[PDB]
Structure 1
Amino acid sequence: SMTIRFHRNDLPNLDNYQVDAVAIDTETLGLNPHRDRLCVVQISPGDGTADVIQIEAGQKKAPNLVKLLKDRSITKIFHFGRFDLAVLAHAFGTMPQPVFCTKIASKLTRTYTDRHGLKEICSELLDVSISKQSSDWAAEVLSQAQLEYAASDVLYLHRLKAVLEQRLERDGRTKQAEACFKFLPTRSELDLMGWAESDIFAHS
C-alpha cells in the first residue's frame, strides 16, 4: 500500500528531493517544544511516497534534512506549521523558510466551516480518506501503524496546496495569505521565545 522509506537520524541523500516544495510533519513527546523532544520527522517530495525519519534523544544534527529546511528555493509545506516550525528550529538550530501552511490557507478560504483539520480538508478538497490515530513516539521501535500514521500526514499536502492556492485566488486573498506565510516563521520564533500563549497583535 503506502510507499514509506524508514530512516534513522536523517535522509541518506537528497536524490528524491530535486524539488521546489516538500511536505513536512513531525511527531514529538507532546505539545511543549522545550519539554517534549522531537521524535519523528516525516517528509514527502510530493510523489505519493514518504520518508519517515526516527530522531534520537539528544540528536541535534540531521545534515540532509537541514539542507532542505535552509534551502530558500524550497517551500516547506505544513498543515499548521506554527507548531512544527518551532519544533524543528528548536531541534536543529535553524528556522525553516519559506513555508506554506494549509491550515492558514484553509482558514482564509473555507469560511463556511469551523473545521480546518487535516482529515476534514483531505476529505472535502481531495476526496481522500485518512485515519486519525495519542502514543509514545519516543519508543525504540515504531510500529508499522505508527509509520503509516506519520506518513499519511505528508502524502497529500502538495495536492492540498494546489487546491488552496486556486481557492485563495478565486476569493481574492492570495496576497494576505502570502504575508501570513512570510510571518509564520517569526510567529514560531515568538512561541519559542516565550509568547506561545499570546497573540502579539491583540490590543490587550
Structure 2
Amino acid sequence: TEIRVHQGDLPNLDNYRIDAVAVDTETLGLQPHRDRLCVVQLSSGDGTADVIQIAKGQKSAPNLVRLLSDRDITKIFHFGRFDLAILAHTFGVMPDVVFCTKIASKLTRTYTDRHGLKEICGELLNVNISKQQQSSDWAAETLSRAQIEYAASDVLYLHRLKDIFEERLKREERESVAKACFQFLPMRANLDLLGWSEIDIFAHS
C-alpha cells in the first residue's frame, strides 16, 4: 500500500482536487495545549495516503491548511472533535465542512456500544486496524514503518465508511440530525480549546 511521507506540508494539492478528503492526526497526547501536533494524515480515498510530519514549533502548512479551509471540500474524520481541536490550535484555522464517522456510528450503530474506528472497520469493511502504535513516540524524527502504517490506516478507509454511514443515516431518516451534529462539531472542538473539554455544555448538570 502506497504511503507518501512528507516533511512539513504536502508538496502540492494535485492529489486533492476532490469533493472530500480523509483527515487524521497524531500528537504527543490528548491535551492540545501541552501535546503538540506531530503528524497529519490525508487520503483521497484511492487507497493511498499522505503522512505529513509536523515539526515542533511549526507555524504553517499552507497546502494542508488550504484544504482544511476549502468549503467545497468535506473533511472526513473519525472522532473529528479531537482532530479539529489540535489542527485549529496549531495552524489557527478551524474547518467548517466536516463529516465524523464516530458521530455517524453513534447515530446508526444503535445495536452496539463499541464505536471505535477499529470496531467500525472490522464490522463494516472486514478491515483489521492494529492499534499497537497508537501510544508511541509520534514526535520521533523518523517514524517507524509500523507508525506510518497505523497513521495511514486511520485515513485509508474513511471514504468507504462515510458511504456506508450515509446509507444508514438515510435508511433510518437521520440525515438532518447528523448534519446539525457535524455543523456544531467545529464549535464543540473550540469549546474544548477554550476550557470546556470536560463539560457537556448541553447537560442539565
Distance 1:70 1:203 in 2: 34
Tell me by how many angstroms 1:183 deviates: 0.3
Deviation of 1:141 after TM superposition, in Å, equals 1.1
**Residue matched to 2:184:** 183
2:137 paired with 1:139: no
In the other structure, the counterpart of 2:25 is: 26
Aligned partners of 2:81 and 2:6: how far apart in 1? Answer: 25
Aligned residue runs from structure 1 range 34-113, under 5 A:
34-113=33-112
Which runs of structure 2 are paired with 1:111-190 in the superposition (5 Å)? 111-133=110-132, 134-190=135-191
Identity of aligned residues (%): 77
Query: Hey, what's the Cα distance between the residues in 1 that align with 2:53 and 2:194?
Result: 26
RMSD: 0.6
SS of 2:155's equivalent? coil
- Matched residue SS, 2:180: helix
- Residue 60 of structure 1, CA deviation: 1.1
CA distance in 1, matches of 2:115, 2:181: 16
Aligned partner of residue 75 in structure 2, secondary structure: strand
Question: In structure 1, how many angstroms separate the alpha carbons of the residues matched to 2:112 and 2:156?
Answer: 24
Gaps of 5+ in 1: none
Post-superposition offset of 1:151: 0.4
* Unmatched 5+ stretches in structure 2: none
Q: Deviations over 1:64-122 (max 9, x none)?
A: 00000000000000000000000000010010120000000000000010000111111
Pairs aligned (count): 203
2:114 and 2:78 mapped to 1: Cα distance? 13
Which amino acid in structure 1 is aligned with residue 67 of structure 2?
Answer: L
Secondary structure at the counterpart of residue 154 of structure 1: helix
TM-score (norm 1): 0.98
Letter in 1 for 2:152: A
SS at match of 1:13: coil
In structure 1, C-alpha distance between the alignment counterparts of 2:20 and 2:96, rounded to whole Å: 11
TM-score (norm 2): 0.98
Runs of 4+ in 1 over 3 A off after TM superposition: none
* Deviations 1:6-59 (CA, angstroms, capped at 9, x unpaired): 000000000000101000110000000000000000110111100000000000
